[PDB]
Structure formats: C-alpha cells, structure tokens
Design a protein around this ligand. Structure first.
Ligand code: FAD
Ligand code: FAD
Ligand code: 79X
Ligand code: 79X
Ligand code: ZN
Ligand code: ZN
Lengths: 230, 230
C-alpha cells in the first residue's frame, strides 16, 4: 500500500464542469498509482430517501418506525439494504473521500444529501462515544470539491452570500468532522459558467496541480473559529 | 380574510414528535379559521432528485444537460413535471410556509432538500436579478420548526455542535431569504428522545401556544450578525 480514493460525484451531465473535475481527479490519482473508485450517484439512480426499505427482512419495531434506531440495529445485524452496504464498503476501504458537487442552496444536491443521510449511519460513521475527533472514520481524509453559481466577490464576508466558510460548516464540521474525518481545505471552483474557456482550464488545472501533492497536505482545524472567527 | 398556511412536513412516522408538532399546528391554525395545507413528503413519495425527468418539453440544449437552465425555461414554457407545479401552486397561495422536520446532519432530510432544489426554481422563487429582498416570493412568511438529537447545551457557542443559529444559515438565509420570504424565529424542539414525558408535552404546548399569536410576530433580521454575532 498504496492509497485508496473514493470520489462521490453528484452531477447529471458528464460534459459538465463537475464531470471534467471528476475525470481530472481520476486521471491524476490513477497516474500516481492510487486505487480509485467513483460513486456516480445520478448514474446509479441513487436512492436519497431515508425510509423503512433501507432495512432488509423484519423490523425491530414495526409499530412506530424510528429511522435512526432501526438503521443502527440493521447495521449491527448486517441487515441494511445493499445500496447502503456497498457505499459503506467503499468508505471503509478509502483513505481519502472526495465529494464532487455543484452547490445547491448553500449545500449539497439532495441526491448527495441522501448519501450522507443513508450511508453514514450510527455504528458505521459514529457512535457514543466515537464522534468528532473520536468518530469511527478517524484517520480518513475528506475533501469537498464544490462548484458555485456565484462569483468569489459574492462569497466574501460582506458580499450578498456571506463567507464561503459559513455554508461549509454543516458539511465540514457537522457532517465530516463529526464522523472522524480530517478535512482538507475545500476546493471551490467559483462561477465556472460566466467564465472564459481559459479561466476554466486554469481552474481544472489547479485542481489537477493540487492533487499532485494531496498526500503531503495538512488538515484544516475544523472549528467554529475556522468557519466564523478571525 | 383570512390567511393561508402550507406545512411542508418531512417525517416517516405519523406517531413521531414531528407528527405531533405537525398535528397541533394543523389543529391550532384550523381553529383560528386559517386555510391549512400539508405536504407530507414521505407519504407523497416525493422525488428529491434533480433530473431531466423534471422537464417534459424540448430541451434548450439537448447535447449538454444543465438543470438550472432547463427548469428555468421549462417553468416559463409550462413544461415542468406536474409534481413540481402542484407544489408551486401551494407555495403561491400561501401566506405562511412552515417546514416541519428532524435535523439531519445540521440540515434538512434529503427529501425536503429535494423539495427546495426542485420546487424553488428560477422564474418561480427568484430571478437574476430579483433575489434576497427582491426575491419573487416577497410578502410571504417562512418558519422552520426543527427537532434535534442533541440538547440545547450542545447547541451553544461553547457546546460541541456550536450555536444552533450556525446551521440555520443555509436554510434561513441562503434559501428562504434569497427567495424573498420574511423569516420568522425558528422553533427548535431540542432533544425530544432524551426529554421526560412532561418536558415533551410542554414542548408540544409551547409550539401550540406560539402559533396562537403567530400573525403578530415580526420577522428576524436575517443577516450574518443574527446568525453569527461577533
Ligand atoms: C437547484 C439549484 C440550486 C442552486 N443553488 C446555488 C447556490 O446556493 N449558490 C450558488 O452559487 N449557485 C447555486 N446554483 C448554481 C450552481 O451551483 C452552478 O450552476 C454550478 O455550480 C455550475 O457547475 P456545472 O458543473 O453544472 O457548470 P457547467 O454549466 O456544466 O459548466 C460551465 C461551463 O464549463 C464548460 N466545461 C466543461 N468542462 C470543462 C473543462 N474541461 N474545461 C473548461 N470548461 C469546461 C461547460 O461546457 C460549460 O460551458 C444552484 C443551481 C441549482 C440548479
Ligand atoms: C440521518 C440522521 C441524521 C441526523 N443528524 C442529526 C444532527 O445533525 N444533529 C442532531 O442534533 N440530530 C441529528 N439526528 C437526530 C434527529 O434530529 C432526531 O432523532 C429527531 O429530531 C427526533 O425527532 P423525532 O420526531 O423522530 O422524535 P421521536 O423519536 O419520534 O420522539 C421522541 C419521543 O416523543 C414521543 N412523542 C411523540 N409525540 C408526542 C407527544 N404528543 N407528546 C409527548 N411525547 C410524544 C415519541 O413517541 C417518542 O417516544 C439525525 C438523525 C438521523 C436519522
Ligand atoms: C449567488 O448566489 C446564489 C446563486 C444561485 C442560487 C442561489 C444563490 O444563493 C443562495 C440558486 C438557486 C438556484 C436554483 C435553480 O433551479 C437554478 C439556479 C439557482 N441558483 C443560482 O445561480
Ligand atoms: C448531537 O449532535 C448530533 C446527533 C446526531 C447526529 C449528528 C449530530 O451532530 C452533527 C446524527 C447523525 C445520524 C445518522 C443516523 O442514521 C442516525 C442518527 C444520527 N445522529 C444523531 O443522533
Ligand atoms: Zn469541525
Ligand atoms: Zn438572510
């Protein structure tokens, strides 16, 4: 060994700027000798809803359904639906998880929100006492690669949309950090669509360039102060 | 006369704490003589995924699928999927929209994130320009009614999960304010699974009692400072 990378990718269109950034991630990490896996959520028609279908066979209480409880129990009893256990297997084996998505409403698209809701269950991603620093996925790196509609000016502390780190908190701290990940600095590709075919190629290339030294990188301190303070 | 209310409700179990909060809201608004509609997302089997199935007419650009561009043009042409347009009709008629959901990863369950992704499209909820204070849904009130797993103390600036207002940002500001809603103070029912019987009953009745005077409330100043202080 050797390192393993999972790219969780959430875009409808392979020719898109998200497609290109995913293809460049695959090419470059593959070049370096890395083991690479991609979850293309839309091509998988990945199920985003948290429902009782997520548990196979019979339920620990079919009278009052409690998703958190029943999925925890199904995880321990190897009874989670196979789309979920497949995703968990890829996360278990990965040293680095990259999420590649367009910003939808200051967050992840719903299909990707559902991956997080469904795959990162109690028992697998976290437990009492295994959370934040002690989360079950400790030692793994996570990285957000996000494209925006709005320009970098719009995302400053006194722009319309506030500081980028404001929306990153629920994903980076609330989700990734809670599960044990060390979170690398986000990669935000601002406003690809109102940009020349040449600021674009430079955005794709700095992503490609950045992946070259990805393993030497230091994890951000994932704190309230990092996201909000000075 | 004569207010209209929409409750967008995202929970699997009618007998849950969310279910109760939703029932008391129906009962209380109904008692006041308000017109009440409930979108029960899980029971509608609501589609969270933003796909090309959401447009039924000729695509603007059939070679490269762009979801934001296609749904904007489908909106103006009236070729959006009818599940989207049924929701837009409920929103259009409403004076107040209440979101009732359990916090999933510092945000909304994916089914409800899909509601926001698919229903609040360009042309309907905002335009460029015509957002934030100029958003197209100006005039309407919005309220988040959220239940948590973590306690109020968790949930504080010096607690593990940070201040509760940190995770409201993408939802209150990035989504609702952007579309032009005035945002009412969120209702957060902290840690109902941990609470005693009387503490739960008191939480239900606090919601009930708040709704009695709901139309006399001023919105919050929905800004970086309200969310983040400092
Ligand atoms: C429901 C919804 C909610 C949204 N919410 C927000 C929000 O909160 N905040 C916000 O800022 N935005 C938001 N947006 C806008 C969204 O984030 C952007 O539309 C998106 O990030 C653009 O990424 P893309 O890959 O789809 O762009 P694309 O349109 O696919 O890419 C831009 C251009 O680059 C070209 N291209 C493809 N590959 C390459 C490459 N090899 N090199 C050079 N050019 C290439 C493409 O052909 C295209 O012309 C939202 C959009 C939707 C639909
Ligand atoms: C995928 C996922 C992600 C999550 N992420 C987070 C997170 O990021 N942060 C966080 O804090 N939490 C998180 N949670 C926890 C979640 O927010 C809570 O479990 C949820 O808010 C609890 O609400 P509920 O309606 O399901 O409670 P229930 O378990 O249904 O309610 C608790 C008790 O109240 C009882 N009850 C129902 N109605 C009444 C009434 N009329 N009067 C008195 N008692 C009543 C119920 O019968 C039950 O016994 C997550 C959970 C999941 C499954
Ligand atoms: C500049 O900051 C934003 C840009 C955009 C949106 C939201 C933003 O701040 C909350 C947004 C929602 C949205 C929804 C669609 O269906 C299509 C495009 C969208 N869009 C953007 O370009
Ligand atoms: C106290 O703060 C949290 C509580 C909980 C979660 C995340 C939290 O902080 C980010 C969370 C994720 C989660 C996922 C499941 O499948 C079932 C239960 C869950 N759970 C909680 O109780
Ligand atoms: Zn953190
Ligand atoms: Zn605001």
């Amino acid at each position: 060994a050797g390192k393993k990378v999972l790219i969780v990718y959430a875009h409808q269109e392979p020719k898109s700027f998200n497609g290109s950034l995913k293809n460049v991630a695959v090419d470059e990490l593959s070049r370096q000798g890395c083991t690479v896996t991609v979850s293309d959520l839309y091509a998988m028609n990945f199920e985003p809803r948290a429902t009782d279908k997520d548990i196979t066979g019979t339920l620990s209480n079919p009278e009052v359904f409690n998703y958190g409880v029943e999925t925890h129990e199904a995880y321990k009893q190897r009874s989670l639906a196979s789309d979920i256990t497949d995703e968990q297997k890829k996360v278990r084996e990965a040293d680095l998880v990259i999420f590649q998505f367009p910003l939808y409403w200051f967050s992840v698209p719903a299909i990707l929100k559902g991956w997080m809701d469904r795959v990162l269950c109690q028992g697998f991603a976290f437990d009492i006492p295994g959370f934040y620093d002690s989360g079950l996925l400790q030692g793994k790196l996570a990285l957000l690669s996000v494209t925006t509609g709005g320009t970098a000016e719009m995302y400053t502390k006194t722009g319309v949309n506030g500081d980028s780190r404001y929306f990153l908190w629920p994903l980076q701290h609330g989700t990734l950090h809670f599960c044990g990940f060390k979170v690398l600095a986000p990669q935000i590709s601002f406003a690809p669509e109102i940009a020349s075919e040449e600021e674009r190629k430079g955005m794709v290339a700095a992503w490609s360039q950045r992946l070259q030294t990805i393993w030497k990188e230091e994890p951000i301190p994932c704190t309230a102060h990092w996201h909000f303070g000075q």
